[PDB]
Design an enzyme around this catalytic site. Sequence first.
Site, PDB file in Angstrom:
ATOM      1  N   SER A   1       2.061   0.823  10.422  1.00 35.35           N
ATOM      2  CA  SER A   1       1.462   0.331   9.183  1.00 35.35           C
ATOM      3  C   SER A   1       2.590  -0.153   8.290  1.00 35.35           C
ATOM      4  O   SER A   1       3.585   0.542   8.124  1.00 35.35           O
ATOM      5  CB  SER A   1       0.673   1.430   8.474  1.00 35.35           C
TER       6      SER A   1
ATOM      7  N   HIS B   1       0.792  -1.226   0.000  1.00 30.63           N
ATOM      8  CA  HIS B   1       0.000   0.000   0.000  1.00 30.63           C
ATOM      9  C   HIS B   1       0.834   1.291   0.000  1.00 30.63           C
ATOM     10  O   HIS B   1       0.439   2.274  -0.618  1.00 30.63           O
ATOM     11  CB  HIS B   1      -0.957   0.002   1.194  1.00 30.63           C
TER      12      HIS B   1
ATOM     13  N   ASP C   1      -0.860  -7.901  -0.483  1.00 27.79           N
ATOM     14  CA  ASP C   1      -0.319  -6.555  -0.235  1.00 27.79           C
ATOM     15  C   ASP C   1       1.205  -6.622  -0.043  1.00 27.79           C
ATOM     16  O   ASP C   1       1.707  -6.489   1.079  1.00 27.79           O
ATOM     17  CB  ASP C   1      -1.024  -5.951   0.991  1.00 27.79           C
TER      18      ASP C   1
END
Length: 575
Positions: free
Chosen positions: A518, A356, A412
């Site tokens: 993240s 991402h 991802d």
Amino acid sequence: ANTFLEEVRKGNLERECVEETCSYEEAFEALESSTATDVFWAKYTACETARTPRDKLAACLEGNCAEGLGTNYRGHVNITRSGIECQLWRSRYPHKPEINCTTHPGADLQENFCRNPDSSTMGPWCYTTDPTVRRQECSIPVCGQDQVTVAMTPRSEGSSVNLSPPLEQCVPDRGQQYQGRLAVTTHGLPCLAWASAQAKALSKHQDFNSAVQLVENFCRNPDGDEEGVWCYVAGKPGDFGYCDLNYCEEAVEEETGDRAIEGRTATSEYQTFFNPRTFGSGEADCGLRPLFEKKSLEDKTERELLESYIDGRIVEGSDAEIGMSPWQVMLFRKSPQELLCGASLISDRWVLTAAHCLLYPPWDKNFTENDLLVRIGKHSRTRYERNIEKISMLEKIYIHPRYNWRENLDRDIALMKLKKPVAFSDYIHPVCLPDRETAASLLQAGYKGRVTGWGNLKETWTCNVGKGQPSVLQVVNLPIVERPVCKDSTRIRITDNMFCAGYKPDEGKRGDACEGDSGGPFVMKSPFNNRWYQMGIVSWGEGCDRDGKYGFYTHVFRLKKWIQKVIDQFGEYLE
Ligand SMILES: *[C@@H]1O[C@H](CO)[C@@H](O[C@@H]2O[C@H](CO)[C@@H](O)[C@H](O)[C@@H]2O)[C@H](O)[C@H]1NC(C)=O
Ligand SMILES: *[C@@H]1O[C@H](CO)[C@@H](O)[C@H](O)[C@H]1NC(C)=O
Ligand SMILES: [Mg+2]
Ligand SMILES: [Mg+2]
Ligand SMILES: [Mg+2]
Ligand SMILES: [Mg+2]
Ligand SMILES: [Mg+2]
Ligand SMILES: [Mg+2]
């Protein structure tokens, strides 16, 4: 409403600018309020196209209709015109809104409905939970009249007479046992020929346990990779491609086919399976922390690692222990500076985070190779520690084929390389490696997981008032979540390349089923061999935004052979 004096005023007013006209100073007479004065104005001039009658007017300022357009509208509907749910009026997932949380208090942009505080070029809209589309309008009646402003579109899933119809039955063994004619991939790309001009002269020092024949130009998997089949492509000289296809539900938890006690006596036993010159280091020596594994020193939370130790409570953010993940890594932007993402470490030269973090257009971003920078083995995010931490550049953007941001972060994943490598230290030391066959046996028994970060995951996604990020990293353990259980949590359908990982959750809270950085680390420690086997990257979870959901992070066990290939390719762009 609900009382005497707050009520009292009501009557006076039902009559002033409703039926008659009114003003600033007329309002400022019977009102008895400074600011409330403008609560009015929003909805008032929103209903500009109706001063009389109150009959027709009725619905407008009550706030359950669209007069002309609908800046009066504050009404309550979960969804938009089509079906896939609206977004809230502050959280920034999937697409980031242009309207952040501080800007418009006029409409009072909170909750998850459809609004228009800004002059829309079509009509009242909300952001979707689907990534294919950023925003869309919604379907409300006219104020005091029955007429939807816009039409619906249902969308659906059929079977043996709606689709086409198809019904396959699955592919066993993860790509080995397959002979097919396909030549179409994820973006919409082709294959190249296995015995033509460029599929033999570089197949030089590789494990070919070759049962299947070398046939033509289709996708295959004779090595024994646990993802699936793939074939070749070409461009600004680079990648090959996994051909996109449906597979089995072959999970790694409890494979079916034919309290316990502790053990130790061993210091390194592993499969030397990777090429240390172009690939380099990190394969044997990993996940044996300089400050812990080597001295046989523990941390505060190793004693507690079992599933049945003190039968389930919730744990708080702890001001964490020093240098106990010397494999920790930051991520930032060039000109100007900006804190971007979290990451994870393995070798002197190779690196990881979750995909991402750049190639996602909805936040306007083809930040290529040189928008970027990193800082390593850090502690106080507010400070710089210079000696203990160090600085190196990053190489090139290696696209994993199966990564689909347009879809739903399915796989991802990507890869990169350090420009200048880095040395092994107290403060600097990598984490260790479980394959499928390691990963599987591990997770049947009762053990815990762990994630860390400066709440960068917690940071990036929502506004989140008050709770300023921890400048020191944050640590806390977590439990397993079964596959029989996890499904019915959310009605949106689920994948086996991700997993449920969170506490038994509560009602009135956001929750800590969502922490660390993240793209950060999802780490563990072995009782087999005292190593530190990781099993995921810290990606998004429902628990972050959606209350009473789980901490949600990505699988790892399958693709052993993706990068086994890449490491020889690294050298080919040199000099
Ligand atoms: C809009 O989304 C709500 C989430 O805030 C949903 O609320 C829940 O609905 C269930 C029943 O389906 C309740 O048991 C629960 O207490 C909670 O209120 C809700 O599904 C949805 N609302 C509408 C009107 O569609
Ligand atoms: C980003 O843009 C460059 C040039 O503007 C282009 O060549 C490149 O293909 C883009 N990045 C990726 C990953 O495709
Ligand atoms: Mg009246
Ligand atoms: Mg006056
Ligand atoms: Mg007056
Ligand atoms: Mg008056
Ligand atoms: Mg007056
Ligand atoms: Mg008064």
